Amino acid sequence: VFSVLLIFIYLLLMAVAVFLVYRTITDFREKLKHPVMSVSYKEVDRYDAPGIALYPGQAQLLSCKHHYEVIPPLTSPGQPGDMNCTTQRINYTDPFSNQTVKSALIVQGPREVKKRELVFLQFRLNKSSEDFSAIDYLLFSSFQEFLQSPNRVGFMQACESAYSSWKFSGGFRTWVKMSLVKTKEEDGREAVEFRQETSVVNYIDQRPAAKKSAQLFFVVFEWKDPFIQKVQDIVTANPWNTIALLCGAFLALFKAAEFAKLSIKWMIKI
Amino acid sequence: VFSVLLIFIYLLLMAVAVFLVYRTITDFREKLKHPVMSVSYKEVDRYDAPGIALYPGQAQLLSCKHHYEVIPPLTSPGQPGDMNCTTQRINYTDPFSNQTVKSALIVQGPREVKKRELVFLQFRLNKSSEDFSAIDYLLFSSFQEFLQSPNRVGFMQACESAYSSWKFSGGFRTWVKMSLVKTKEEDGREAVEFRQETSVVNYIDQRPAAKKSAQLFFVVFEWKDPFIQKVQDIVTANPWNTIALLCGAFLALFKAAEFAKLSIKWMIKI
Amino acid sequence: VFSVLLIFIYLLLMAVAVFLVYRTITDFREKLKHPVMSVSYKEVDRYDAPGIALYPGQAQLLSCKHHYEVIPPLTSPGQPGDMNCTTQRINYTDPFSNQTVKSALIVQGPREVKKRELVFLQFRLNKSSEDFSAIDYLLFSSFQEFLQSPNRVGFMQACESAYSSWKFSGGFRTWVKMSLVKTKEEDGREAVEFRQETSVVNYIDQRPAAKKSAQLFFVVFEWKDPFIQKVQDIVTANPWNTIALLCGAFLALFKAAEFAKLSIKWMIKI
Ligand SMILES: *[C@@H]1O[C@H](CO)[C@@H](O)[C@H](O)[C@H]1NC(C)=O
Ligand SMILES: *[C@@H]1O[C@H](CO)[C@@H](O)[C@H](O)[C@H]1NC(C)=O
Ligand SMILES: *[C@@H]1O[C@H](CO)[C@@H](O)[C@H](O)[C@H]1NC(C)=O
Ligand SMILES: *[C@@H]1O[C@H](CO)[C@@H](O)[C@H](O)[C@H]1NC(C)=O
Ligand SMILES: *[C@@H]1O[C@H](CO)[C@@H](O)[C@H](O)[C@H]1NC(C)=O
Ligand SMILES: *[C@@H]1O[C@H](CO)[C@@H](O)[C@H](O)[C@H]1NC(C)=O
Ligand SMILES: *[C@@H]1O[C@H](CO)[C@@H](O)[C@H](O)[C@H]1NC(C)=O
Ligand SMILES: *[C@@H]1O[C@H](CO)[C@@H](O)[C@H](O)[C@H]1NC(C)=O
Ligand SMILES: *[C@@H]1O[C@H](CO)[C@@H](O)[C@H](O)[C@H]1NC(C)=O
Ligand SMILES: *[C@@H]1O[C@H](CO)[C@@H](O)[C@H](O)[C@H]1NC(C)=O
Ligand SMILES: *[C@@H]1O[C@H](CO)[C@@H](O)[C@H](O)[C@H]1NC(C)=O
Ligand SMILES: *[C@@H]1O[C@H](CO)[C@@H](O)[C@H](O)[C@H]1NC(C)=O
């Protein structure tokens, strides 16, 4: 009889609708689980002067100077002189140890990325009773933000956790190219971080044998390129799109069901 | 006449429907071609002890010891002593050469990433007739998995292809920070790999001139951060979503066609 | 009265439709703002011979030779001999300085990635009055494309801007593993770039004290793996999908409105 076939068609269509609802729910759940990553790049005419927190310890800073695209040859390596850059010395308790006080030398970083500005730092360590001598350094976004802060100690403690710290060793020239990566936390706040490319070059020590005891650290900081990399977690689970899909599919199924009923009626009539 | 205009409207709507079907098919084909990448991060309280397969050759292991956040100064570099770590020596044929047998020293890696655990290894090579002396090392996920295996040789041969191997040279201290990246192969299997950040520091050789002939390798392994990076290939080509779009568009086109016919009839009647 | 309730229902449904249109427009605008990144990998049986533009300056090239998976020990470091590779010397004005003419030594790179082909280069610098001695190098895709070009000078000037240049220093062996990353610019053009992993190994100088003045550069170029990484910016803003969603939702809303009117009529009648 036609009635049983029509009822079976209705049941099949309702089962298809239920399965489609299940599939849409599972897809929405899956897309909530895994947001997709999108990467863009931002051109900058001038970077904001980064803060370079150096942790020399007993290593005295011989020289710190800004250069453009090239470093003039050293007049006399291992000798103090030519310190033209803004520096701030800070003492702050380590956020993790709570016992070791860190003394940091904050140096204002380069700004003209287009002009290939670099900052060159020369340190000397004299008679260190410790093999594997290296200087720690941390990079943060703004030196001015460090200056115009009410709690510089708290700012440095926050930097200890927000940013990563690297090292540069003596007997080398360490060339550091910096890059800014800003990650959107889809909450109105963006986390900025530094990615640094390091190249070490041997230092040709032409000092007298007596002066070989003191060891020299050379480090250069510049920007890799005038591109800030922005990383955003795009959500592909839109409830309105899902409900629009469901509504359209339900309307299609209802229209198909009533077309089937009309076709059955037409077959019965003729 | 109104009939010709209505038939032309029907033909235009059917052509639009066909073009929309073509566009949807092309979009589904394109989305099948290029799945989108999604990156997430996993917090870990404790890492599973990684296996560090070292290939020293004739270089004897002076020392291997676990430290926390800092390495105590060497009592006497170049002298054996203080070997507290679990190691396993293995001999296995190279999967690619089929002739060169590799002898590997498997070392259990650090676990407490939160406590900044590191493993410090000191090797000595005495009178090597080969310039550019370096030790190969490979990283795999679990030392325990290596232990509780029926074919350790086959496990090492599989590691030779699954993981990448790096080198650390003498006259340096090589600081290696490890990171785990798990890539989903959308097939029920996930491929795990190691990404390592390497920083070399000069070793200040304060040995007697006689002892300068033997060269020393210092390497440190720890974890960069308590974050495992998961990378998944999300497919954006859902056949059910595409068929729902097509059904909704077809219903819209049919309803618009019958509205147009009704409007033509209303214009004719009045 | 039922009429006021029905009119209020119609107004509510039209407001819902307007809000849904607003949401769809905002979603389309957002998806236009941020295309999603998709990463794939391409297997290669043989790479196209890359061009390695070396900038030695006064450093003479002692040796340049192709090896497979291993470098034979040096017969006599610091001595010329065994130069078997195709090289081209070029002079071109620096695109940025417009005054400094760069002299480049273009070397044909390795091809058999499967066979682990590498190219080994040995340079010597004799009595350089400049500390921090290093040689610049740039990588571009094809040496043949450099050969079969009408303006080699213009090709090199374009490479100065299209590709990135690194350095390798004396007193080391610099192991460079190359990788090709092709980014689709969604405009019919793809930008190819080189990513290089560098490992430095100490050179054990066993030369006489007289010969220690001349400094030696050792560099190796090979391919990291037979995988070319393709990065594409997929656009998730399809106007046809959006209009299909809107049409389906509008049909659903109209059908719901007429169902509501019919239900009100049925309630009034009985
Ligand atoms: C340091 O640099 C500033 C930059 O304007 C310059 O005015 C000053 O003379 C420099 N210092 C010395 C000692 O020359
Ligand atoms: C910071 O610490 C150093 C030693 O670590 C000390 O010489 C210096 O006086 C301290 N600074 C202040 C402001 O107390
Ligand atoms: C470390 O110091 C902080 C700040 O003074 C304070 O919460 C407490 O003394 C310590 N916190 C710990 C041990 O978690
Ligand atoms: C190293 O020499 C510098 C030069 O003045 C001096 O200030 C410093 O106290 C010396 N340190 C040691 C440990 O000799
Ligand atoms: C090695 O470390 C274990 C850790 O518990 C310790 O018990 C043992 O005494 C150490 N070995 C020596 C020789 O002290
Ligand atoms: C592994 O090889 C080394 C030499 O490469 C050899 O001394 C050692 O005995 C071998 N191990 C076994 C278990 O045969
Ligand atoms: C290499 O050794 C394997 C395992 O013994 C075996 O398949 C065969 O001898 C070689 N395979 C090659 C050459 O493909
Ligand atoms: C190097 O010295 C160690 C110290 O005992 C010794 O075991 C080894 O055989 C020596 N090797 C050579 C090549 O002299
Ligand atoms: C350089 O390599 C080619 C490769 O076929 C070889 O024919 C030639 O003999 C080599 N040069 C010398 C001097 O052996
Ligand atoms: C390229 O420049 C070098 C010096 O930088 C010079 O010796 C050489 O002759 C120049 N080449 C040509 C073709 O002029
Ligand atoms: C640099 O040289 C180019 C090419 O000869 C020419 O446009 C002009 O002389 C300079 N361009 C500048 C300074 O922008
Ligand atoms: C260095 O030695 C090489 C060897 O022939 C010679 O060609 C070159 O002119 C020398 N340079 C200097 C600056 O002595």
Taking the alpha carbons of B142, B146, B150, B154 in that order, is the dihedral positive or negative?
A: positive
- State the Cα angle at C62 between C60 and C63, rounded to 5°: 135
How far does C45 lie from chain A, in Å, by closest CA? 30
Going by their DSSP bridges, the two strands A227-234 and A190-202 should be labelled as unpaired
Task: Kindly state whether A266 is in contact with chain B, defined as any CB-CB distance less than 8 angstroms.
Answer: no
- Interface contacts (A, C; CB < 8 Å): 84
Which residue among C38, C199, C240 places its CB closest to the CB of B166? C199
Q: Which amino acid is at A248?
A: G
Distance CA A57, CA C206 (A): 36
Beta strands in C164-243 (DSSP E): 165-169, 172-184, 190-202, 215-223, 227-234
Q: Give the end-to-end CA distance of chain A in Å, rounded to a whole number.
A: 16
Phi/psi of residue B105, nearest 5 degrees: -110, 105
A103 lines ligand 2 (CB under 6 A): yes
Distance CA C54, CA C62 (A): 13
What does the DSSP assignment read for chain C?
Answer: -HHHHHHHHHHHHHHHHHHHHHHHHHHHHHHHH-PEEEEEEEE-SS----EEEEE-TT-EEEEEEEEESS-PPPSSTT----EES-EEEEEEE-TTTSSPEEEEEEEE----TTTTEEEEEEEEE-S-S-SS-EEEEEEES-HHHHHT-S-HHHHHHHHHHHS-EEEEETTEEEEEEEEEEEEE-SSS-EEEEEEEEEEEEE----S-GGGGGSEEEEEEEEES-SEEEEEEEE----HHHHHHHHHHHHHHHHHHHHHHHHHHHHHHH-
Are A133 and B173 an interchain contact pair (Cβ–Cβ within 8 Å)?
Answer: no
| Residue found under tokens 């959107």 | A184
Q: State both tokens at B137.
A: 């090392």
C58 lines ligand 12 (CB under 6 A): no
Going by their DSSP bridges, the two strands B190-202 and B87-93 should be labelled as unpaired
Breaks following residues of chain B (C-to-N distance > 2.5 Å): none
Task: Kindly state whether A257 is in contact with chain B, defined as any CB-CB distance less than 8 angstroms.
Answer: no
Tell me which of B124, B126, B207 to substitute to probe ligand 8's pocket, judged by most ligand atoms within 8 Å of the beta carbon: B126
Domain spanning A42-233, CATH class: mainly beta
What does the DSSP assignment read for C253-268?
Answer: HHHHHHHHHHHHHHHH
For residue A210, the SS3 value is: helix
C91 lines ligand 10 (CB under 6 A): yes
Going by their DSSP bridges, the two strands B36-43 and B51-55 should be labelled as unpaired
Return all residues near C15 (Cβ < 8 A) that are at least 6 apart: none
In this structure, which ligand is nearest to the CA of A79? Answer: 4
Residue A245: list chain B partners with CB under 8 A: 241, 244-245, 248
Domain boundary assignment for chain B:
2-34+237-269, 44-226
B195 CB-side CA count, 13 A: 12
Q: Are the C-beta atoms of C214 and A215 separated by less than 8 Å? A: no
| Residue found under tokens 């292991």 | B61
- State the Cα angle at A217 between A213 and A219, rounded to 5°: 170
Instruction: Count the helices and strands in chain A (H runs, E runs).
Output: 4, 13
Residue C240: list chain B partners with CB under 8 A: 20, 23-24, 27
Task: Kindly state whether C77 is in contact with chain B, defined as any CB-CB distance less than 8 angstroms.
Answer: yes
Distance CA B176, CA B117 (A): 12
Buried b vs exposed e over B108-139: b needs ≥16 C-beta within 10 Å? bbbbbbeeebbbbbbbbbeebeebbbbbebbb
- The CB density around residue A13, as the number of other CB atoms within 10 Å, is 15
Atom nearest to C128 CA in ligand 12: 13
Are C132 and A36 an interchain contact pair (Cβ–Cβ within 8 Å)?
Answer: no
**Structure resolution in Å?**
2.6
Tell which residue, B115, B116, B110, has the closest CA to residue B85.
B110
C60 lines ligand 10 (CB under 6 A): no
Q: Are the C-beta atoms of A93 and A101 separated by less than 8 Å? A: yes
Distance CA C55, CA A133 (A): 32
In this structure, which ligand is nearest to the CA of B98? Answer: 7
Tell which residue, A140, A147, A178, A181, has the closest CA to residue A161.
A140
Q: Which amino acid is at A107?
A: V
How far does A246 lie from chain B, in Å, by closest CA? 8
Residue nearest to atom 13 of ligand 12 (CA): C127
Q: Which of C76, C122, C201 to probe the B interface (max B CBs under 10 A)?
A: C201
C127 lines ligand 12 (CB under 6 A): yes
- The CB density around residue B253, as the number of other CB atoms within 10 Å, is 17
Distance CA B238, CA B32 (A): 9
In this structure, which ligand is nearest to the CA of A215? Answer: 4
Distance CA B80, CA B87 (A): 16
Distance CA A142, CA A163 (A): 12
How far does C39 lie from chain B, in Å, by closest CA? 7
Which residue among C20, C36, C130 places its CB closest to the CB of A73? C130
Residue nearest to atom 2 of ligand 6 (CA): B103
Q: Name the experimental technique.
A: cryo-EM
Which residue among C37, C128, C248 places its CB closest to the CB of A244? C248
- Interface contacts (A, B; CB < 8 Å): 84
Taking the alpha carbons of A8, A9, A14, A15 in that order, is the dihedral positive or negative?
A: positive
Are A131 and B36 an interchain contact pair (Cβ–Cβ within 8 Å)?
Answer: no
C126 C-alpha to ligand 12 centroid (Å): 6
B128 C-alpha to ligand 6 centroid (Å): 19
Distance CA B92, CA B160 (A): 11
Instruction: Count the helices and strands in chain B (H runs, E runs).
Output: 4, 13
Phi/psi of residue B47, nearest 5 degrees: -75, 155
Distance CA C85, CA C65 (A): 6
Distance CA C113, CA C48 (A): 10
Distance CA C124, CA C212 (A): 11
What does the DSSP assignment read for A124-184?
Answer: EE-S-S-SS-EEEEEEES-HHHHHT-S-HHHHHHHHHHHS-EEEEETTEEEEEEEEEEEEE
For residue B66, the SS3 value is: strand
Beta strands in chain B (DSSP E): 36-43, 51-55, 60-68, 83-84, 87-93, 101-108, 117-125, 134-140, 165-169, 172-184, 190-202, 215-223, 227-234
Q: State both tokens at B102.
A: 């590799």
Residue A170: list chain B partners with CB under 8 A: 202, 204
